[PDB]
Amino acid sequence: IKVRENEPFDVALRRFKRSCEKAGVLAEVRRREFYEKPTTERKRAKASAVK
């Protein structure tokens, strides 16, 4: 979660949060408890991941 750097620093370059929290994990927990849509969203996500 943290970053620090010594005096050679210019830019933020914190892409630790395109790794874990920001993009998916908080936008996922904005909306409803189903049990049902996730079983089919994961079903078609794993059925789309195919050659």
Partner: protein, 55 residues
């Protein structure tokens, strides 16, 4: 993997923010991913490892 007190090994199999790493990344056949995770959780109860990095 079988053991939870070896937190060097467990600390390899965990990310920088306390989260268990998927076997999609680290190899780790599923039996040992299950033993692994369960050992990580037993270690987080004992405060050998952290649950997160914002305690």
């Amino acid at each position: 993997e079988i053991d939870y007190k070896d937190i060097a090994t467990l600390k390899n199999y965990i990310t920088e923010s306390g989260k268990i790493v998927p076997s999609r990344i680290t190899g780790t056949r599923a039996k040992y991913q299950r033993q692994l995770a369960r050992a990580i959780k037993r270690a987080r109860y004992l405060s050998l490892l952290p649950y997160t990095d914002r305690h």
